[PDB]
Amino acid sequence: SMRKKIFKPEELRQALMPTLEALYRQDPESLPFRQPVDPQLLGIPDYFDIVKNPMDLSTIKRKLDTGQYQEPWQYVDDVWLMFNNAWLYNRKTSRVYKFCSKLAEVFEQEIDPVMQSLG
Ligand SMILES: CCc1c(C(=O)N[C@@H]2c3cc(Cl)ccc3CC[C@H]2O)[nH]c(C)c1C(C)=O
């Protein structure tokens, strides 16, 4: 755990994109996560006060596509940031909160064999 191997961006993309596609495939559950939260449109000006580091599927996709992840745990961390933001901000009865919980179920199943294979 002290030796950090090198990952090429195209390799990470090939390995990790199917786990992101698994999240996009969830419908309607991925719909609130396919674009960044817009607190102006949604009328929630306090959103950025509570959620200091916004994250969504389109941002994760862009970071994968543009080679911004150096290691696979940085991708896992962004996915979980998106989950934790939604669980922090939203009430437990809300569609977003429940949809988030479903995505986290899906993602944990998809990501496990991929992380084992990347090392
Ligand atoms: C509740 C506002 C919120 C949304 C959101 O996407 N809200 C709308 C929406 C909602 C649903 Cl359930 C389905 C589609 C759409 C598409 C339009 C979109 O504005 N996303 C997140 C992550 C949040 C928060 C604050 O965490």
| Final resolution, Å | 1.6
User: Of 101, 4, 86, which is closest to residue 44 (Cα–Cα)?
Assistant: 86
Which residues does a 6 A CB cutoff place in the pocket of ligand 1?
Answer: 31-33, 37, 41-42, 44, 47, 86, 89-90, 95-96
Say which residue the tokens 């970071």 belong to. 63
Residue type at 93? T
DSSP 1-60: --------HHHHHHHHHHHHHHHHTSTTTTGGGSS---HHHHT-TTHHHH-SS---HHHH
Residue type at 85? N
Q: CA 25, 60, 68 angle in degrees (round to 5)?
A: 140
What are the chain's domains?
1-119 (1.20.920.10)
Q: What is the best residue among 59, 90, 93, 96 to mutate for testing ligand 1's pocket, by most ligand atoms within 8 Å of CB?
A: 96
How many other C-beta atoms can be found within 10 angstroms of the C-beta atom of residue 84? Answer: 16
**For residue 96, which atom of ligand 1 is closest to its CA?**
12
Q: What CA–CA distance (Å, rounded) separates 74 from 71?
A: 6
Rounded to the nearest 10°, the torsion over CA 31, 33, 23, 102 is -80
CB proximity list for 52: less than 8 A, separation 6 or greater: none
